[PDB]
């Protein structure tokens, strides 16, 4: 025995004396073997959900997950059922599929899980400090309350003609259209929709000054900030590269522009009820009496515009793409436009938008087939027991929920891979509570989150943008339909999603051919 402890020591010294080749080689081959041994041992644990096997340590199942998450989830679901874990770039993600998963994660106790712990790197570098996920949850709840106060039915009545003006100006002035000069053309929807989206959301939420800025070199800062919104931040939120410097600069420059306007409006008492800026200036004092700073207000503006930017632009791109191979649906939507707007003799209003059920069902169905966020998650802060199981999810794990996956299951949506707006007949609401409501600080919302359709999530982190998105998308699509027909280049069809970006946008280039329904129609203005 004593002779063996000596040879331990001897073995240590010989190990350290190995050639620099073998030692390097051992450096990688040792934790490769340990990783594999640990997993086999982990599988013996009956209080842990099954863990997807993987070869490369740290990296885990990152490649297959990020490239086709729904295919990954379905294969895992077959082998293990609805609850399973996988390693993702240093983290352990526990996935809970289906409505019970929704309930488990979206309705989890505030003390059990943290969204800001999961997300703050995806957002704080882009938006700025003090808001969204760079603040306690109770602060987020009131920020959501503040933003929601600019998102009223009255606001939407005022936004609808502004959004319409931007769409028509885009049709008139953009090189992608020029409808006064050209009667047919080809566009990349991943070019047009981001532009139309920022033009319409700027004009309505930020106001005319901020909209005007986008006609200048200033627009390039939005591009820079936009490029700083990437899943890469999930791993590398700060790296000494030019990319990261333009982002940080952009955030500074853009928040500075918003603060400049804010300070001017106050130093002119020019504070009204026009836009989200006026609203936050009048209404951004927390319940404990602390006021948001001008910097925090500006940062909150950036976050709200950036969030609405990517979800919405992706969604209208998908709407155009699905309709491009469905002239029957374009036709049905057009007849509804003619009926509700009296053959075009009525001006579009917010109230008339609500009387367009097929148009709204089209948005609704697009959001079913294309949830812009395939995976939502939280960091586990306290050990969680999974009801009706012996599973315990340890703190330090992350939980992942994917309502978009359930959107595409035949059990909940018959022929789920078929685009059919009529599956929503007499059910054209963006969403609704089928029962009890609860209020987390930004208004009463559904207490239950068991709906198999959950494009806007649920619980305390639920979206507050849904009515703005439908308003924006509704106006945009109403004008598209009334103005244009469109179709695919020969042999093209709906592209597959790119699941590696922040949202699940179409893989580009995604081109459609438009043509004017009324070639002689002119769009006025200078």
Ligand X SMILES: CC[C@@H](C)n1ncn(-c2ccc(N3CCN(c4ccc(OC[C@H]5CO[C@](Cn6cncn6)(c6ccc(Cl)cc6Cl)O5)cc4)CC3)cc2)c1=O
Binding region: 119, 133, 144, 378, 461, 463
Q: Least distance from C-beta 5 to ligand HEM, angstroms?
A: 54
Show the binding pattern over residues 486-515: x = contacts ligand X (CB under 6 A), - = does not.
Answer: --------------x-x-------------
Which of ligand HEM, ligand X, none does residue 464 bind (CB under 5 to 8 Å by kind)?
Answer: ligand HEM
With binding defined as CB under 6 A, does residue 311 bind ligand HEM? yes
Say whether residue 465 binds ligand X (CB under 6 A).
Answer: yes
Say how many residues touch ligand X, by CB under 6 A: 23
Q: Give the torsion through C-alpha atoms of 136, 398, 83, 374, to 10 deg.
A: 80
User: Binders of ligand X among 204-233, rule CB under 6 A?
Assistant: 231-232
Q: Which of residues 105-134 bind ligand X (CB under 6 A)?
A: 119, 122-123, 132
Tell me the closest approach of the beta carbon of residue 479 to ligand X, in angstroms.
Answer: 23
**Residues 501/231, Cβ–Cβ less than 8 Å:** yes
Binding-site member from 140, 206, 313, 359 for ligand HEM (CB under 6 A): 140
Within positions 66 to 125, which residues make up the interface with ligand HEM, using CB under 6 A?
115
Alpha carbons 154 and 279: distance in angstroms, whole number: 13
In the list 461, 486, 499, 510, the residue contacting ligand HEM (rule: CB under 6 A) is: 461
Contact between 372 and ligand HEM per CB under 6 A: yes
Q: Under the criterion CB under 6 A, does residue 86 sit at the interface with ligand X?
A: no
Q: What's the order of all strands across the beta sheet hosting 511-516?
A: 184-188, 511-516, 484-487
Q: What is the 3-state secondary structure (H, E, C) of 429-477?
A: CCCCCCCCEEECCCCEEECCCCCCCCCCCCHHHCCCCHHHHHHHHHHHH
| Coil vs helix vs strand at 494 | coil
Distance CA 54, CA 62 (A): 10
Residue reference for tokens 């331990």:
8
| 223: region left, alpha or beta (phi > 0 left; psi from -120 to 50 alpha) | alpha
Which one of ligand HEM, ligand X, none is in contact with 306 (Cβ closer than 5 to 8 A by kind)? ligand X
Q: Which is nearer to ligand X, 459 or 465 (CB)?
A: 465
339: Cβ contacts below 8 Å, ≥ 6 apart:
none
Using the minimum distance from each CB to ligand X, give the nearer residue, 104 or 442.
Answer: 442
Q: Which is nearer to ligand X, 381 or 392 (CB)?
A: 381
Residue count of the chain: 526
Is residue 197 within the footprint of ligand HEM (CB under 6 A)? no
Q: Please tell me whether residue 451 binds ligand X under the rule CB under 6 A.
A: no
**77 contacts ligand X (rule: CB under 6 A):** no
Spatial neighbors of 491 by CB under 8 A, at least 6 apart, are none
Residue 381's binding partner among ligand HEM, ligand X, none (Cβ under 5 to 8 angstroms by kind) is none
Task: Name 377's bridge partners.
Answer: 400
Q: Is 459 in the site for ligand X (CB under 6 A)?
A: no
- The distance of closest approach from Cβ of residue 120 to ligand X in the complex, given in angstroms and rounded to an integer, is 10
475 binds, among ligand HEM, ligand X, none (CB under 5 to 8 A by kind): none
Give the one entry of ligand HEM, ligand X, none that residue 375 binds, where binding means its C-beta sits below a cut-off of 5 to 8 angstroms depending on kind: ligand X
Give min distance, CB of 331 to ligand X, in A: 32
Cis peptide before 290 (omega within 30 of 0): no
Neighbours of 341 (CB within 10 A): 18
The option from ligand X, ligand HEM, none interacting with 254 (CB < 5 to 8 A, set by class) reads: none
Other CB atoms within a 10 A radius of the CB of residue 224 amount to 19
Helix axes 466-483 and 189-201, enclosed angle (nearest 10): 120
* Binding segment toward ligand X, per CB under 6 A, in 43-51, 303-311, 321-329, 407-415: 303-311
On whether the CB atoms of residues 212 and 206 are closer than 8 A, the answer is no
375 binds ligand X (CB under 6 A): yes
**Choice from 465, 495, 497, 506 touching ligand HEM (CB under 6 A):** 465
453 binds ligand HEM (CB under 6 A): no
Ordered DSSP codes for 121-183: HHHHHHH-SSSTTSS-HHHHHHHHHHHHTTSSHHHHHHHHHHHHHHHHHHHHH-TTT-TTT-S
402 binds ligand HEM (CB under 6 A): no
Query: Does position 316 bind ligand X by CB under 6 A?
Result: no
Strands 184-188 and 444-446: unpaired
Give the other-Cβ count within 10 Å of 152's Cβ: 13
Burial class for 11, CB neighbours closer than 10 Å (0-12, 13-18, 19+): exposed
Instruction: Report what 234 binds from ligand X, ligand HEM, none; CB cut-off 5-8 Å by kind.
Output: ligand X
- Residue 397, classed as helix, strand or coil, is strand
Q: Identify the residue among 99, 125, 457, 506 touching ligand HEM (CB under 6 A).
A: 457
Between CA 113 and CA 95, with CA 71 as vertex, the angle to 5 degrees is: 15
Select from 239-247, 304-312, 349-357, 478-486 the region that touches ligand X (CB under 6 A): 304-312
Instruction: Give CA–CA dist 313/189, Å, rounded.
Output: 9
Q: Which option in ligand X, ligand HEM, none does residue 89 bind, with CB closer than 5 to 8 A by kind? A: ligand X
Calpha distance 63→388 (Å, rounded): 32
202 binds, among ligand X, ligand HEM, none (CB under 5 to 8 A by kind): none
Q: Which residues bind ligand X (CB under 6 A)?
A: 66, 89, 119, 122-123, 132, 231-232, 234-235, 303-304, 306-308, 311, 373, 375-376, 463, 465, 500, 502
Q: Which residues bind ligand HEM (CB under 6 A)?
A: 115, 140, 144, 147, 304, 307-308, 311-312, 315, 367, 372-373, 376, 455-457, 461, 463-465, 468-469
């Amino acid at each position: 025995v004593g002779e063996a402890l000596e040879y331990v020591n001897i073995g240590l010294s010989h190990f350290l004396a190995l050639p620099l080749a073998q030692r390097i080689s051992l450096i990688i081959i040792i934790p490769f073997i340990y990783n594999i041994v640990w997993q086999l041992l982990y599988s013996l644990r009956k209080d842990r959900p099954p863990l997807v096997f993987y070869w490369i340590p740290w990296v885990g199942s990152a490649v297959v997950y990020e490239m086709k998450p729904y295919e990954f989830f379905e294969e895992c679901q077959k082998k293990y059922g609805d609850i399973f874990s996988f390693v993702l770039l240093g983290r352990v993600m526990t996935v809970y599929l289906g409505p019970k998963g929704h309930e488990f994660v979206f309705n989890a106790k505030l003390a059990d899980v943290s969204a800001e712990a999961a997300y703050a790197h995806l957002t704080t570098p882009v938006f700025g400090k003090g808001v969204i996920y760079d603040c306690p949850n109770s602060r987020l709840m009131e920020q959501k309350k503040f933003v929601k106060g600019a998102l009223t039915k009255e606001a939407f009545k005022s936004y609808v003609p502004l959004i319409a003006e931007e769409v028509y100006k885009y049709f008139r002035d953009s090189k992608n259209f020029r409808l006064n000069e050209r009667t047919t053309g080809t566009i990349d929807v991943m070019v047009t929709q981001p532009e139309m989206t920022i033009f319409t959301a700027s004009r309505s939420l930020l106001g005319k000054e901020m909209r005007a800025k986008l006609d200048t070199d200033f627009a390039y800062l939005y591009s820079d900030l936009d490029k700083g919104f990437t899943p890469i931040n999930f791993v590398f939120p700060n790296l000494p590269l030019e990319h990261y410097r333009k982002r940080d600069h952009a955030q500074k420059a853009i928040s500075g522009t918003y603060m400049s306007l804010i300070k001017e409006r106050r130093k002119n008492n020019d504070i009204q009820d026009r836009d989200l800026i006026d609203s936050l200036m009048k209404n951004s004092t927390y319940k404990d009496g602390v006021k948001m700073t001008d910097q925090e207000i500006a940062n909150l503006l950036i976050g709200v515009l950036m969030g609405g930017q990517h979800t919405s632009a992706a969604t209208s791109a998908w709407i155009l793409l699905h309709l491009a191979e469905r002239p029957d649906v374009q036709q049905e939507l057009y007849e509804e436009q003619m009926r509700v707007l009296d053959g075009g003799k009525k001006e579009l209003t917010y109230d008339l938008l609500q009387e367009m059920p097929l148009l709204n069902q089209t948005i609704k169905e697009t959001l079913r087939m294309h949830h812009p966020l395939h995976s939502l998650f939280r960091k586990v802060m306290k050990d969680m027991h999974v009801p009706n199981t012996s599973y315990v999810i340890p703190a330090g794990y992350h939980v992942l929920v994917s309502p978009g996956y359930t959107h595409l299951r035949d059990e909940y949506f018959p022929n789920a891979h078929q685009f059919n707006i009529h599956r929503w007949n007499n059910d054209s609401a963006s969403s609704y509570s089928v029962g009890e409501e609860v209020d987390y600080g930004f208004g009463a919302i559904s207490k239950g989150v068991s709906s198999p359709y959950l494009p806007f999530g649920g619980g305390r982190h639920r979206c507050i943008g849904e009515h703005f998105a439908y308003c924006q998308l509704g106006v945009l699509m109403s004008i598209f339909i009334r103005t244009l027909k469109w179709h695919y280049p020969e042999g093209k069809t709906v592209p597959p999603p790119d699941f590696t970006s922040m949202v699940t946008l179409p893989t580009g280039p995604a081109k459609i051919i438009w043509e004017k329904r009324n070639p002689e129609q002119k769009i006025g203005g200078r």
